[PDB]
């Protein structure tokens, strides 16, 4: 079933939690949940489009120059994405900054374009890209929410100005009247949170295996 890939890529093979890929945007643009959600959505869109293009162009890539071709097929698309969200989502573009342009070198994107998109049809590749993007977005949302709560208390902030007023319902506040721990926002707060998330994933995987046993 084609839907197997979409569910399998969520937790069994996570880009940032299992394969140890896409760590730069995971650790950099995570100080707010909205930043993580926007980066995840952009990465998912780029992954879907690049996977579809590569699979449609599968039987045309020379074996020895495979990278500089496919990288181009990614790079230009990424450029377009920038030239989209710099024009109609400028508030989010100013926040992400360099890492919206740094999706060409995203290890997850090229890894999925090479490993799966060169030996699968267009529909399975699209579903695999969607699953990887969804998993990356979930990880980004979780880490951003944890860091934002530890640093300021609020969960999701300035979503109306960034993602549009339509998402205004997402602005919730946790721990009212809280100055927050400043270290969570800072770079030292990202590695520790990611390590704790990895440890929690290992613990829940072991407990789930025991329950299945």
């Amino acid at each position: 079933v084609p839907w197997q890939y979409f569910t399998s890529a969520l937790w069994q093979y996570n880009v940032a939690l299992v394969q140890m890929l896409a760590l730069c945007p995971t650790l950099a643009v995570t100080t707010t949940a909205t930043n993580g959600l926007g980066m995840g959505l952009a990465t998912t869109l780029v992954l879907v489009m690049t996977n579809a293009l590569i699979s449609s162009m599968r039987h045309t890539i020379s074996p020895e120059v495979r990278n500089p071709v496919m990288i181009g097929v990614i790079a230009g698309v990424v450029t377009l994405t920038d030239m989209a969200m710099n024009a109609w989502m400028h508030e989010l573009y100013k926040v992400l900054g360099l890492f919206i342009a740094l999706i060409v070198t995203n290890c997850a994107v090229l890894g999925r374009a090479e490993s799966f998109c060169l030996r699968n049809p267009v529909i399975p590749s699209i579903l695999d890209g969607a699953g990887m993007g969804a998993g990356f977005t979930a990880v980004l949302v979780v880490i951003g929410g944890i860091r934002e709560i530890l640093g300021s208390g609020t969960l999701f902030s300035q979503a109306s100005s960034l993602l549009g007023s339509h998402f205004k319902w997402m602005e919730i506040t946790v721990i009212p009247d809280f100055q927050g721990i400043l270290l969570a926002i800072l770079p030292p707060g990202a590695f520790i949170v990611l390590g704790f998330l990895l440890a929690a994933k290992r613990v829940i995987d072991r407990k789930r295996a025991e329950r299945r046993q």
Binding site: I181, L182, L183, L186, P188, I192
Partner: protein
């Protein structure tokens, strides 16, 4: 199961070493506690008790034997963190520092003997980064039973809860004051002539941390530790010599901008870090040349970030950097074996 030798052992133990280190720290801690009054006592007690409780909880979680709580490895960390904090600091600063050290810095790596970074300095850096306002408020010396220091319940309201410290009970120290007055286009000489006395600063009559103030009782404790074979003289000697040499050279080159020698030695937590904190066995080289390199690096980094950096004191940062650099020093400066050259090849005769 058969027993393996040897069947003889000296009179040594981790408990004795840790308790002797605490005994060496005792006189300077008493001098600090008496000088600043009740709030310092409250903060020190809270920090030590919280460190012990968190260590017990972490030992319970990991399943390690509770006897590990009786070796004094947690009480020493709490003691050093408490004497590193500002005197009239709130309780939550000490509790959070103890939680961040005993916890992430030590017990998250396995326990005693496994951590690669100094726990007390890790907690100090984390507290300074997270809460800069509470970690840059120094109380002037208000001696216990001096008719001007706050009473018992007034000190309780100062430490616990959030009663303001009023006015006239908080001032600037030496290093920060010198840097600020340098930013006020005043040369380095006039600042020290009318705002710094070496004799009073050496005794410990200046504002600062809880136990950092006195540079003489700490020296006595360090010397006593050295005579007891508990620490090695290489690290303290190297740190002090490097700081003094660099400071004296800078003073000689440009006396109107650099202050060096006695001013650098009798200011900040240089002596305490050199004797009791940079000599951490688990996070220091096990060789002799390694210890010399560790001390030289600590001294150079301390002086460089003191003078040209953005901090009035960087003993914790230098210690953390050298703890990071320690494994390479250990793996590249191993002692020579018997019957082999430095490269390890067998000798020829």
């Amino acid at each position: 199961s058969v027993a393996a030798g040897p069947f003889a052992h000296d009179r040594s133990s981790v408990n004795r070493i840790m308790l002797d280190v605490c005994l060496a720290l005792t006189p300077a801690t008493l001098f600090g506690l008496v000088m600043f009054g009740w709030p310092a006592i409250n903060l020190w007690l809270v920090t030590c008790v919280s460190a012990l409780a968190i260590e017990a909880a972490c030992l319970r979680l990991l399943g390690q034997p509770m006897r590990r709580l009786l070796d004094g490895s947690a009480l020493l960390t709490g003691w050093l963190l408490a004497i590193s904090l500002p005197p009239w600091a709130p309780w939550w600063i000490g509790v959070g520092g103890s939680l961040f050290a005993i916890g992430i810095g030590k017990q998250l790596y396995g326990g005693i003997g496994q951590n690669p970074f100094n726990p007390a300095m890790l907690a100090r850096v984390a507290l300074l980064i997270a809460f800069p306002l509470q970690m840059t408020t120094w109380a002037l010396p208000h001696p216990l039973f001096s008719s001007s220091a706050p009473g018992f319940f007034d000190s309780l309201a100062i430490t616990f809860a959030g009663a303001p410290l009023a006015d006239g009970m908080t001032g600037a120290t030496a290093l920060g004051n010198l840097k600020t007055e340098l930013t006020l286009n005043r040369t380095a000489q006039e600042i020290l002539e009318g705002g710094f006395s070496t004799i009073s600063a050496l005794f410990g009559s200046t504002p600062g941390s809880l136990g950092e103030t006195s540079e003489l009782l700490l020296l006595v404790g360090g010397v006593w530790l050295v005579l007891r074979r508990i620490i090695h003289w290489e690290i303290p000697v190297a740190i002090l010599a490097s700081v003094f040499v660099m400071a004296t050279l800078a003073y000689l080159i440009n006396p109107e901008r650099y202050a060096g020698g006695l001013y650098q030695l009798t200011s900040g937590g240089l002596i305490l870090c050199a004797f009791f904190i940079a000599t951490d066995p688990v996070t220091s080289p096990i060789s002799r040349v390694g210890r010399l390199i560790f001390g030289v690096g600590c001294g150079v980094l301390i002086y460089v970030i003191r003078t040209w950096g953005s901090f009035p004191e960087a003993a914790a940062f230098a210690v953390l950097f050298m703890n990071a650099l320690t494994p390479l020093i250990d793996r590249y400066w191993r002692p020579r074996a018997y019957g082999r050259n430095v490269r390890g090849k067998p000798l020829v005769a």
